[PDB]
């Protein structure tokens, strides 16, 4: 296994983008460089939290440095415009 | 597979620069000043040639931070600064 | 729209000048001399047009600050010097 499945639901959109991406872990700054339209955004993933009742939270990452969590294997991520 | 990028800045002079693989394809003034440990106030510069003369390519100042830094022989090589 | 003006400096003799790009129509010495992340004792010069003989252009040393630098074929070449 030298990949990553990395989806994401885009400004909205109900069908979510599919990519694979080789690494077992990634950034978002790797992340930041599938997305084709310029702006600014947030970016929030799935990933488990005990601190939650049910189960899931969105966290929202910031930091290009920053590894994205996991959630059930793969990365899944919602990008939101801003405004 | 090429899939990260060589970044090396020199730091307030200090000769030996220091050398760092970032993950991706193009790196962000951010994206570098993430990987800086001092707090502070800097400017930073990064090689990139210009088409101006001799010994010369220049230092580009970058600011914005969700700028591209320029690439140089397909490394980045900054300079920082702290403003004295 | 222009905006901006493109100024670069050659520093102590340091081959590569550092360049970056000044909002607004034209600059005075001391908005460059908030570039500048080294203190101490400097003086200051621009090339710009002469009417003197064999290389052409000059120098020209600035230090009011109020002073509006000289443009050399659309950018601002200067040179920082500092005092030895
Ligand atoms: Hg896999
Ligand atoms: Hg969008
Ligand atoms: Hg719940
Ligand atoms: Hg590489
Ligand atoms: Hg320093
Ligand atoms: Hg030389
Ligand atoms: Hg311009
Ligand atoms: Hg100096
Ligand atoms: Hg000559």
Same mark, same amino acid.
Request: glycine share 8%; with cysteine; proline share 4%.
């Given at each position: 296994?030298? %990949?990553?499945?990395? &989806?994401?639901?885009?400004?909205?959109?109900?069908?979510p983008?599919?990519?694979? +991406?080789?690494?077992?872990? +990634?950034?978002?700054?790797? /992340?930041?460089?599938?997305?084709?339209?310029?702006? %600014?955004? @947030?970016?929030? /993933?799935?990933?488990? %939290?005990?601190? /939650? $009742?049910?189960?899931?939270? =969105?966290?929202?990452? @910031?930091? $290009?440095? &920053?590894i994205?969590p +996991? =959630?059930?294997?793969?990365?899944?991520?919602?990008?939101?415009?801003?405004?």
């Amino acid at each position: 296994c030298d %990949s990553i499945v990395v &989806a994401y639901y885009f400004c909205g959109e109900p069908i979510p983008y599919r990519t694979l +991406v080789r690494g077992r872990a +990634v950034t978002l700054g790797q /992340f930041k460089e599938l997305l084709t339209k310029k702006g %600014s955004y @947030r970016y929030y /993933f799935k990933k488990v %939290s005990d601190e /939650f $009742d049910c189960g899931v939270v =969105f966290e929202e990452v @910031r930091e $290009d440095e &920053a590894i994205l969590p +996991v =959630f059930e294997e793969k990365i899944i991520g919602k990008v939101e415009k801003v405004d």
